């Protein structure tokens, strides 16, 4: 109902204390009894809320759904993000951000429980099941030249990897320049885009797709042997809000790094985190297609590739399969 | 009314022949008498239409207004443009295009008689008076790397200059990289932008502002000594449709050139068309500010600048006053 997010917001915020029906009713100027309906609704979509006589209500656990009212807390505390848009189902978080960034200078992100027209690179499909992943777009506003896009895409990768690492008991490796793996399982695809002209970047738009909670059973057979989810590498079980929280801080940490450090400062960390070395890779370029070894990452974010015919290459980007 | 554009479309198209009330009524399935109302309306907004008994109607001259129905003819005949959007008044053609390009691969342009929030570079104001200029945004879809933006901006300039040249009896010079002059009068500002990522350009968006019909009296005093309009350099008088027609062909010619030639092939033509040589210029860069001579344009579209302290510079872009 109209007041569902507001009740949630107050519950989230009053932790770890209990808030009464009464007090919620005063805050929102509604009846005690409309407050009980709201709370019954929430209990039923899987909010876990302790209700105790004489004391009131305590939100204990959220379900696998994004709620505007909760993420408004994230945006208020945040120095980087002006606001967020939260959706149940949408064509694409990325399409939505590209439309919202027009005509303002705000930094925001967009989340949706499901995408019905999720896209990765080169217009491939990106599977985005309801309840099962974080499907997010982030818009930011760095004052920098349009060349700097590639360097952005390097910092953000270490951020995303760190946030996933904190939750899997197995190793999380980056696959340059746009994917994150646990073993042979791709767990995130991410993608960075921009609007810019000669005078600079107007917005960076970063599309982040992370498998959260899928069982192997839940991926389509075409990708099932090469896909995984954070839940499949977590002992204790995985909360999407706590996850989102860590993800946002990592992004901010990595973003200020991007603003303030040369790529040389994180390069070594990046090599060490990467799973492209000492192994044979498939490169695709508009037609041509070749095997190659990754040799190195140069001071400026180029992959040095020892091609297969022995010719060397310097790539600011590529697309690679194992 | 509902049928105003359709009547116009049929009139434009049936040139140089006369079309009857009758025949227009059959085409659109409306009464002969609703057709006369439509034609009275048009005569009154300044369509000049010859009506002759027994023969019918001939559109002779359009007023200083954009009409969707006429520009739909432009788009149909055109191999480059999928469609156009025409507005009387709008915040910005550029904002509008950035919103329409999202989620499709169409090439189109947008026109508006007046902009209420016209922007040039660095967020400066761009004056866009009703009835007095072509305020257009063009979206295109070249398969090319994001570096190629600057080279695009070089070809399009020679196109815009040529279209204006065809109508002024005085010389039209380009001021690199974003403006067009007749004598000391800036007549167009143009601006090219993109949406892109590492893998290529998703769209080029070109904002073109051209003064058509203003009298010196019509520009604000702040810019009046450094602004001019095509009408002020034309003997015979200036028609915005014929103008738009030439502009579109020039853009297409220059765009295929951009797709198919190195910048070396048009460089000399570009130097010869430019009004930055043999004279003293003011450069602004985020703070710093310096005088300089333009020395040369290198094979790749960089301006070679002999700074004032004698240091040389290689600029892919700049902003310059005389
Ligand atoms: N959930 C998933 N997990 C693992 N692999 C997937 C997957 N969905 C598709 N795949 C496979 O991996 C490929 C991914 O393609 P790329 O490497 O081009 O994908 C790239 C990264 C894509 C970014 C997706 C996020 S979701 C939020 C935002 N809005 C979306 O529209 N885009 C972004 C597919 O072609 C499949 O082979
Ligand atoms: N009509 C005009 N004619 C000449 N000078 C003008 C003018 N309006 C403003 N000026 C002056 O010239 C400057 C132009 O700034 P820049 O050089 O940054 O301007 C640049 C080129 C701007 C592009 C304008 C077109 S209109 C259609 C499309 N949608 C719009 O929102 N943008 C584009 C101003 O700061 C004034 O000094």
XYZ file of N, CA and C in Angstrom, chain A residues 102-103, chain B residues 87-97 99 112 114-119 126 128:
69
model
N 20.195 12.033 -18.364
C 20.068 13.147 -19.296
C 19.545 14.459 -18.655
N 20.295 15.546 -18.823
C 19.878 16.826 -18.321
C 20.118 17.118 -16.843
N 9.425 19.893 -33.211
C 8.818 20.526 -32.048
C 8.717 22.021 -32.248
N 7.753 22.662 -31.598
C 7.631 24.104 -31.743
C 8.604 24.708 -30.746
N 8.529 24.231 -29.497
C 9.362 24.681 -28.390
C 9.656 23.488 -27.517
N 10.848 23.435 -26.932
C 11.376 22.229 -26.238
C 12.534 22.730 -25.361
N 12.887 22.018 -24.285
C 14.080 22.442 -23.506
C 15.405 22.486 -24.368
N 15.627 21.439 -25.192
C 16.825 21.246 -25.999
C 16.679 20.060 -26.951
N 16.949 20.323 -28.237
C 17.055 19.218 -29.222
C 18.069 18.145 -28.800
N 19.161 18.569 -28.159
C 20.209 17.673 -27.721
C 19.776 16.717 -26.586
N 19.087 17.261 -25.612
C 18.535 16.482 -24.509
C 17.519 15.456 -25.075
N 16.667 15.930 -25.968
C 15.703 15.102 -26.585
C 16.389 13.957 -27.349
N 17.391 14.271 -28.180
C 18.049 13.161 -28.892
C 18.704 12.185 -27.934
N 17.745 11.210 -25.210
C 16.685 10.342 -24.688
C 16.076 9.375 -25.759
N 13.459 21.884 -33.490
C 12.551 22.660 -32.642
C 12.701 24.120 -33.011
N 12.217 26.674 -31.241
C 12.772 27.442 -30.170
C 13.277 26.438 -29.124
N 14.377 26.781 -28.458
C 14.842 25.978 -27.332
C 14.794 26.871 -26.148
N 14.475 26.317 -25.000
C 14.273 27.165 -23.844
C 15.426 26.901 -22.912
N 16.220 25.881 -23.238
C 17.383 25.571 -22.423
C 18.538 25.064 -23.320
N 18.783 25.824 -24.379
C 19.875 25.567 -25.295
C 21.235 25.684 -24.655
N 22.052 24.666 -24.858
C 23.403 24.631 -24.304
C 24.504 24.490 -25.393
N 23.091 28.812 -25.122
C 23.004 29.010 -26.544
C 21.626 29.578 -26.875
N 18.437 30.500 -28.614
C 17.706 29.897 -29.750
C 16.308 30.462 -29.967
